[PDB]
Amino acid sequence: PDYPRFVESVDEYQFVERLLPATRIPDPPKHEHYPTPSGWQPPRDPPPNLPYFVRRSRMHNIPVYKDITHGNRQMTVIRKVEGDIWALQKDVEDFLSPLLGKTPVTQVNEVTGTLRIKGYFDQELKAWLLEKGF
Amino acid sequence: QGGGARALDLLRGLPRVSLANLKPNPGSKKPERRPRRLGFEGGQTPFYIRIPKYGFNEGHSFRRQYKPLSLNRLQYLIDLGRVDPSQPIDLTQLVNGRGVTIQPLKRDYGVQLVEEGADTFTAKVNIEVQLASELAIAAIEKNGGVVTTAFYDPRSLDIVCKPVPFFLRGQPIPKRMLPPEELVPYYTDAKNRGYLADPAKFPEARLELARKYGYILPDITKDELFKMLCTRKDPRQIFFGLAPGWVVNMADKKILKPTDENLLKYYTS
Amino acid sequence: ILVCPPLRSRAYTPPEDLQSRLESYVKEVFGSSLPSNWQDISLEDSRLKFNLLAHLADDLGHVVPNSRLHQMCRVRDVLDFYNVPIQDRSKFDELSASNLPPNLKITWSY
Amino acid sequence: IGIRLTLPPPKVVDRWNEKRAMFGVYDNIGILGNFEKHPKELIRGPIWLRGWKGNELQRCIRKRKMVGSRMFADDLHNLNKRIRYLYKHFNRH
Amino acid sequence: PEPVLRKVELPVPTHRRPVQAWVESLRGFEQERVGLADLHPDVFATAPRLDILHQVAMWQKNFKRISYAKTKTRAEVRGGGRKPWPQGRARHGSIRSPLWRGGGVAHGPRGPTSYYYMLPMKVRALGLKVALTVKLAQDDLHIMDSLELPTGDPQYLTELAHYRRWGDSVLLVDLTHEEMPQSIVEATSRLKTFNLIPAVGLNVHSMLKHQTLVLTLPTVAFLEDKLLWQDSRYRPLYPFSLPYSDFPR
Amino acid sequence: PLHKYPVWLWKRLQLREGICSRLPGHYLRSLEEERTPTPVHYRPHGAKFKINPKNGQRERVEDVPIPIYFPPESQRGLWGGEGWI
Amino acid sequence: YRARPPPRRRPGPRWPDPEDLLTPRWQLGPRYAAKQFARYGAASGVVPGSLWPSPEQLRELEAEEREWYPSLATMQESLRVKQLAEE
Ligand SMILES: [Mg+2]
Ligand SMILES: [Mg+2]
Ligand SMILES: [Mg+2]
Per-residue 3-state assignment (H helix, E strand, C coil) for chain B:
CCCHHHHHHHHHHCCCCCCCCCCCCCCCCCCCCCCCCCCCCCCCCCHHHHCCCCCCCCCHHHCCEEEEEEHHHHHHHHHCCCCCCCCCECHHHHHHCCCCCCCHHHCEEEEEEECCCCCCCCCCCEEEECEECHHHHHHHHHCCCEEEECCCCHHHHHHHHCHHHHHCCCCCCCCCCCCCCCCHHHHCCHHHCECCCCCCCHHHHHHHHHHHHCCCCCCHHHCCCHHHHCCCCCCCCCECCECCCCEEECCCCEEEEECCHHHHHHHHC
Candidates D31, D52, D82; nearest CB to E114: D52
CB A64 within 8 A of CB A126: yes
Is residue B7 a contact partner of residue E48, using CB atoms and an 8 Å limit? Answer: yes
G contact test, residue of B167, B234, B259, B262 with most G CBs within 10 A: B262
Q: How many CB atoms lie within 10 A of CB D28?
A: 25
Q: Report the separation in Å between the CA atom of E107 and the middle of ligand 2, taken as the mean of its atom positions.
A: 17
What Å distances lie between residue C6 and B200, C93, E164, E168, CA to CA? 94, 21, 11, 18
CA-closest candidate to residue E114, choices E64, E53, E52: E64
d(CA E249, CA E161): 36
| Contact indicator for A78, A63 with CB cutoff of 8 Å | yes
Judged by its nearest atom, the ligand closest to the C-alpha of residue E108 is 3
- Amino acid at position D87, single letter: Y
Which of C49, C57, C65 minimises the CB distance to E139? Answer: C65
Name the minimum distance, in Å, from the CA of G23 to any CA of chain D: 15
Helix (H) or strand (E) holding A77: strand A73-78
Judge whether C9 and C88 are in contact, CB under 8 Å.
Answer: yes
Contacting B residues, span 60-79, partner chain F, CB-CB under 8 Å = 62
- Chain F nearest CA to G45, separation (Å): 29
Question: Whose CA is closest to E231, among D84, B249, A57?
Answer: A57
* CA dihedral over E213, E216, E217, E223, signed as positive or negative: negative
C3 beta partners: none
Distance (Å, whole) CA F58 – CA F78: 41
Task: Please report, in angstroms and rounded to a whole number, the separation of the first and last CA atoms in chain D.
Answer: 45
> E229 and chain A: CB distance < 8 Å anywhere?
yes
Helix (H) or strand (E) holding A65: strand A64-69
Q: CA torsion E147→E149→E153→E155, rounded to 10°?
A: -80
Residue G48 CA to residue B248 CA, distance in Å, equals 11
Torsion sign, CA atoms E58, E61, E64, E65: negative
Contact in structure between G14 and G44 (CB atoms under 8 Å): no
Residue type, B101: T
The identity of residue E70, as a single letter, is K
Please answer whether residues B115 and B135 qualify as being in contact, where contact means their C-beta atoms are separated by less than 8 angstroms: yes
**Residue B219 and residue B231: Cα distance in Å, rounded?**
16
What Å distances lie between residue B40 and B49, B51, D93, CA to CA? 10, 14, 13
Residue of G46, G47, G52 to mutate, interface with A, max A Cβ within 10 Å: G52
Domain count, chain G: 1
**Nearest partner of E39 among E65, E62, E6, judged by Cα:** E6
Report CB contact under 8 Å: A5, G52: no
Secondary structure E strands in chain E = 4-6, 19-24, 35-39, 66-67, 113-114, 141-144, 170-174, 194-198, 212-216
Cβ burial A59-94 (10 Å sphere, 16+ → b, else e): ebebbbbeeeeeeeeebbbbbbbbbbbeebbebbee
> How many domains, chain A?
1
Cα–Cα distance measured from residue C4 to residue C13, given in angstroms and rounded to the nearest whole number: 25
- What does the radius of gyration of chain C's CA atoms come to, in whole angstroms? 19
Q: How far apart are CA C39 and CA C46, in angstroms?
A: 17
- In sequence order, the β-bridge partners of residue B194 are B149
Please state, in angstroms and as integers, the Cα–Cα distance from residue C91 to each residue in B18, B249, E238, following that order. 23, 71, 58
Distances (CA, A) of G16 to D50, E16, G30, G32: 22, 54, 13, 10
**Are the C-beta atoms of residues D52 and E116 closer than 8 Å to each other?**
yes
List of chains touching A (3+ CB pairs within 8 A)? B, E, G
- The Cα–Cα gap between D59 and E114 comes to 9
F63 vs F60: CA distance, rounded Å: 10
> Which range of residues forms the domain containing residue B173?
62-269
Angle subtended by helix axes C18-30 and C75-82, to nearest 10: 150
Q: Please classify residue D13 by burial: count the beta carbons closer than 10 Å to its beta carbon, then call 0-12 exposed, 13-18 middle and 19+ buried.
A: exposed
Q: Is the peptide bond before A46 cis (omega within 30 degrees of 0)?
A: yes
CA distance E197 to B178: 58
User: Quick one: how far is CA B75 from the chain centroid?
Assistant: 15
Count of residues for chain F?
85
User: N- to C-terminal Cα distance for chain B?
Assistant: 70
In angstroms, the separation between the Cα of residue B8 and the nearest Cα of chain G is 31
Instruction: Residue A121: count other Cβ atoms within 10 Å of its Cβ.
Output: 22
Burial string for E156-170 (b: 16+ CB within 10 Å, else e) reads: bbbbbbebbebeebb
Q: Does B196 reach chain G within 8 Å, measured CB to CB?
A: yes
Between CA C42 and CA C27 the distance in angstroms is 13
For residue E239, what is the nearest residue in chain B, using CA coordinates?
B165
Single-letter amino acid code for the residue at B209 = L
- Give Cα B125 to chain centroid, integer Å: 16
What residues of G are in contact with residue E198 (Cβ under 8 Å)? 3, 6
Give E193-245 as a DSSP string. Answer: SEEEEEGGG--HHHHHHSSEEEEEHHHHHHHHHHHHHHHHBPPPSS-TTS--S
> Are the beta carbons of B31 and A113 closer than 8 angstroms?
no
CA E19 – CA E48 distance, rounded (Å)? 15
Phi, psi of E198 (to 5 degrees): -80, 165
Ligand 3 midpoint to CA E113 (Å): 20
In 3D space, the residue among D20, D36, G10, G7 whose CA is nearest the CA of residue E201 turns out to be G7
CATH code (residue G76): 6.10.280.120
Q: How many separate helices (H) and strands (E) can be counted in chain A? A: 3, 7
d(CA B173, CA B268): 12
Termini Cα distance of chain E: 34
By C-alpha distance, the chain D residue nearest E247 is D34
Of B2, B123, B164, which is closest to A20 when you measure between CB atoms? B164
Question: Helical H runs in C3-110?
Answer: 18-30, 46-60, 66-69, 75-82, 91-97
Of E139, E143, E133, E142, give the one whose Cα is nearest residue E46.
E133
How crowded is the C-beta side of E32, counted as CA atoms within 13 Å? 22
Instruction: Please report, for residues F6, F10, F22, F75, the alpha-carbon distance to residue F28 in angstroms, rounded to integers and kept in the order given.
Output: 21, 16, 9, 22
Task: From chain B, pick out residues whose CB is under 8 angstroms from the CB of F58.
Answer: none
- Smallest CA–CA distance, residue E236 to chain A, in Å, is 7
The domain containing residue G52 runs over which residues? 1-87
Q: Secondary structure of chain F in the HEC alphabet? A: CECCCCHHHHHHHHCCCHHHHHCCHHHHHHHHCCCCCCCCCCCCCCCCEEECCCCCCEEECCCCCCCCECCHHHHHCCCCCCCEC
Reference B108, options B149, B154, B69, B71; nearest CA is: B154
What's the gap in Å between E105 CA and the centre of ligand 3? 7
Report how far residue E30's alpha carbon sits from residue B215's, in angstroms, rounded to the nearest whole number: 80
Q: E158 and E191 in contact (C-beta within 8 Å)? A: yes
How far away, in angstroms, is D2 Cα from ligand 3 center? 21
B68 — phi, psi (to 5°)? -80, 130
Is A13's Cβ below 8 Å from some Cβ in G?
no
Kindly compute the dihedral angle of the four CA atoms of residues D24, D30, D36, D40, in this order, to the nearest 10 degrees.
Answer: 60
**Resolution of the structure, angstroms:** 2.6
Torsion of CA C53, C54, C58, C64, to 10 degrees: 50
E161: CB partners within 8 A, 6+ apart: E167, E170, E194, E212
Is the CB of B170 less than 8 angstroms away from the CB of G75? no
Q: Quick check: E150 and E156 in contact, CB under 8 A? A: yes
- As a residue count, chain C comes to 110
3-state secondary structure at position C78: helix
User: If we measure between CA atoms, which residue out of C22, C16, C13, C19 comes closest to residue C56?
Assistant: C22
Cα diameter, chain B: 84
Name the minimum distance, in Å, from the CA of G48 to any CA of chain D.
Answer: 26
DSSP E170: E
Rounded Cα distance, C58 and E19, in Å = 22
DSSP state of E2: -
CA C57 to chain centre: 7
- Residues linked to residue E6 through DSSP beta bridges, in sequence order: E37
What type of residue is F25? G
Give dist(CA B14, CA B27) in Å, integer: 24
Domain count, chain B: 1
Residue A1 placed within a domain: no
E110 to D56, D63, D78, E67, G64: CA distances (angstroms): 7, 13, 13, 9, 52
Query: Is the sign of the CA dihedral G71, G75, G81, G84 positive or negative?
Result: negative
**Mutate which of E234, E240, E247 to disrupt the A interface (most A C-beta within 10 Å)?**
E234
Task: Output Rg (C-alpha) for chain D, integer angstroms.
Answer: 21
Q: A131 phi and psi, to 5 degrees? A: -65, -40
Q: What is the full DSSP assignment across C12-40?
A: B---TTHHHHHHHHHHHHH-SS--TTGGG
Positive or negative, the Cα torsion across B128, B129, B134, B139?
A: negative
- Cα G76 to Cα B180, C88, G62, G82: the distances in Å are 10, 95, 21, 10
- For A61, the domain range is 6-134
The letter for the amino acid at B216 is I
- Residue C86 CA to residue C9 CA, distance in Å, equals 10
Contact residues, chain G, for A6 at CB < 8 Å: 48-49, 52
Helix (H) / strand (E) element for D64: namely helix D56-67
Give distance in angstroms: CA of C52 to centre of ligand 1.
52
Architecture of the domain delimited by E2-248: 3-Layer(aba) Sandwich (3.40)
Contact assignment for G50 to A3 by CB distance below 8 Å: yes
- The DSSP secondary-structure symbol of A32 reads S
- What SS3 state is found at C83? coil
Q: Look at residue B170 and tell me if it is in a domain.
A: yes
- Of E161, E180, E169, the C-alpha closest to E218 is E180
Contact partners, residue E243, CB within 8 Å, separation at least 6: A20, B164, B250
Tell me how far the alpha carbon of residue E95 lies from the centroid of ligand 3, in angstroms.
12
DSSP chain G: -BPPPPP-PPPS-----SS-TTS-GGGTSHHHHHHHHHHHGGGG---GGGGSPPHHHHHHHHHHHHHHS--HHHHHHHHHHHHHHH-
**C-alpha angle with apex B202: B198 to B207, nearest 5 degrees?**
160
Give CA–CA dist C55/D54, Å, rounded: 62
Give the separation between CA B6 and CA B8, rounded to whole angstroms. 5
Nearest CA in chain A to B238: A19
Contact between residue E53 and residue E208 where contact means Cβ atoms under 8 Å apart: yes
CA distance B79 to B121: 11
Q: What Rg do the C-alpha atoms of chain G give, in angstroms?
A: 24
Which amino acid is it at F64? V
Q: Which of E110, E116, E169 sits opposite D56 (nearest CB)?
A: E110
- Number of C-beta neighbours around residue E119 at 10 A: 18
From F26, A51, E244, G12, select the one nearest B96 (Cα to Cα): E244
Measured between CA atoms, the residue of chain A closest to residue G58 is A4
Q: Does residue D68 sit at the E interface (CB-CB below 8 Å)?
A: no
Sign for the CA dihedral angle at A119, A124, A130, B2 comes to negative
| Closest-CA residue of chain A to B81 | A28
